[PDB]
């Protein structure tokens, strides 16, 4: 940050610090060449990334298949000195080459259960059980991710509390109205106490009898 401190001025006088200035230039020119070395290695590499991404583009865009993940298997990676799979094959150690690392079991909508070599741009990290996933239509590989399924009836089912019947418009019905509060309403509101004490919460309830 701080150049030519108090200390360097006493030590070495101004004339000397001229000879110092010249030596510095010579070494700055050396380092300056390395920047041209490094720039280049960076320039070629960018070109490579975009050349790949162009080949991907065609496969990747819609249309493709919809599937579900049954489970992420998480098959082994590396236990041999060649490939990434237990079996010994011609290839060599990579995520994909002829080597297969992780894999996952999907249940297609084409009514098949496919165990597939895993892609580079979809990892097992990016999954969980029971996730909806785009799988390429023609060859079965996890191609891209999708959020979880949503359905029109499912969305509707949440919220319908109004019409409300309360307990002032339902004539009598006790013991049972009291019992319902104890099971449900009373632990719902004082929820913090119920954690602290260590007692269980009722594990649902069944209300039954003639209609």
């Amino acid at each position: 940050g701080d150049d030519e401190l108090d200390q360097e001025i006493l030590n070495l006088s101004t004339q000397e610090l001229q000879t110092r200035a010249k030596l510095l230039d010579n070494e700055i020119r050396i380092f300056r060449s390395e920047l041209q070395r490094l720039s280049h290695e960076n320039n070629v590499m960018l070109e490579k990334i975009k050349d790949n991404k162009e080949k991907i583009k065609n496969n990747r865009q819609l249309p493709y298949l919809v599937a579900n993940v049954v489970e992420v298997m998480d098959m082994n990676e590396i236990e041999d000195k060649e490939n990434s799979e237990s079996t010994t094959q011609g290839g060599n150690v990579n995520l994909d080459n002829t080597a297969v690392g992780k894999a996952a079991v999907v249940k297609t909508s084409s009514r098949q259960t496919v165990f597939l070599p895993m892609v580079g741009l979809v990892d097992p990290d990016k999954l969980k059980p029971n996730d909806l996933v785009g799988v390429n239509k023609d060859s079965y590989l996890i191609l891209d991710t999708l959020p979880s399924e949503f359905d029109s009836r499912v969305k509707a089912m949440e919220v319908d509390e109004k019409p409300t019947e309360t307990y002032s418009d339902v004539g009598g019905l006790d013991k049972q109205i009291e019992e319902l509060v104890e099971a449900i309403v009373l632990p719902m509101k004082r929820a913090d106490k119920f954690k602290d004490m260590g007692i269980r919460a009722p594990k649902g309830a069944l209300m039954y009898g003639p209609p």
Binding site: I56, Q61, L62, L65, V66, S109, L121, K137, D144, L146
Partner: protein, 106 residues
């Protein structure tokens, strides 16, 4: 013939993305599939992806049409798509019950 479909749900490629450019969720430009800026050096054509369920009961994300509007194709609407290529081109009329209901009424 178009093979018959209905949109289960719509989820859109213009703001949850679908390809890899520099983002894996949300497009800014929002008339592109994957672009948040125009200085990426790419631009796409994307209106919305639409997830349809066929009368084969296999499910697909299906491409765009040739005159379709994003304001016509939505959940609960019948649409026709290709039978081997999986792309909406022409939408279909609402409902699918008039087959049983014309005979029951008299």
């Amino acid at each position: 013939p178009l093979q018959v479909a209905r949109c289960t749900k719509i989820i859109k490629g213009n703001g949850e993305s679908d390809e890899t450019t520099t983002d894996n969720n949300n497009s800014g430009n929002s008339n592109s599939n994957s672009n948040q800026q125009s200085t990426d050096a790419d631009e796409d054509d994307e209106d919305a992806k639409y997830v349809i369920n066929l009368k084969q009961i296999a499910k697909f994300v299906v491409g765009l049409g040739e005159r379709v509007s994003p304001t016509d194709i939505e959940e609960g609407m019948r649409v026709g798509v290709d039978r081997s290529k999986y792309n909406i081109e022409l939408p279909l009329p609402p409902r699918i019950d008039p087959s049983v209901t014309m005979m029951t009424v008299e």
